[PDB]
């Protein structure tokens, strides 16, 4: 149903993911670092790409929640690992 592909430019202070949800589109996508108590809003880019720019270094694994345009809300824990690979697709 839902996949997260790590996009180029992703580094310790920038996470870029191509999010593809089958039969729907993302209205909002958020991430939470394994260590972190707070969800952070990602910014919608072109072609399903969502990005987050961090003041401090980001450390995965990364949890995501989202809201689809049709109104579906979900959360997926530890979808993208700490030591992720750019170009790799991660799925629940």
């Amino acid at each position, epitope marked *: 149903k839902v996949t997260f592909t790590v996009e180029k430019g992703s580094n310790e202070k920038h996470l870029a993911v191509l999010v593809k949800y089958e039969g729907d589109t993302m209205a909002e996508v958020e991430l*939470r670092e394994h260590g*972190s*108590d*707070e*969800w952070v809003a990602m910014t919608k880019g072109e072609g399903g790409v969502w990005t987050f720019d961090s003041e401090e270094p980001l450390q995965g694994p990364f949890n995501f*929640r*989202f*809201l689809t345009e049709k109104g579906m*809300k*979900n*959360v*997926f*824990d*530890d979808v993208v690992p700490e030591k992720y690979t750019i170009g790799a697709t991660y799925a*629940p």
Partner: antibody
Amino acid sequence: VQLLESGPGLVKPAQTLSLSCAVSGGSIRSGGYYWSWIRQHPGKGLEWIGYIYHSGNTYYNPSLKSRIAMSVDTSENKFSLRLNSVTAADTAVYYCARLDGYTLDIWGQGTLVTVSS
Amino acid sequence: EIEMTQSPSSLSASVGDRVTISCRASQRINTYLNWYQHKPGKAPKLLIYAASSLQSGVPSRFSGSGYGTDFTLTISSLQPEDFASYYCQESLSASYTFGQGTKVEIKR
């Protein structure tokens, strides 16, 4: 999707309170949700116990975490709570609930547990 | 930790009254804000999410507003079955902190 609490309504002090929540109309193994336990003690508000992701990740109320163990069983489509070393302060109505990342949209009916004899 | 504080603690209002209940977050939480109704002996019921979205099947008399710190649940025309405790809840943090509850009683 529907949730139903089951387990003893009477637990002896210092023993473990065990409850299970049976999920129907949906598969826990599919992911997408945190599976939650929330309770209410008599004159008090709603208190978080904790929540668990089906992969195993668990999030506990810090004031209870030492006594709390939650589990999930994907094969039986249920998730459970064990709260050790209970006292009368754990007498409460215990609710299981589904958390979609944002909201607790589906709840069980609640089950009373009296810490006992 | 985020603290969620509701006002008033309790109120009595008549059938047909417009009733409002407030919820204040200790830090900015945008619209990461839900409202629940809890009738004793029943499961809590999600009324509102994302500050102003009405949960499917919840009656139209319930509405929500606000952004950031101060939020308001409105019951546009109170019905006698609406006595309950009502709870806000933040969804910015992984604690999903509940407010302390506001008890609504029916004046007659």
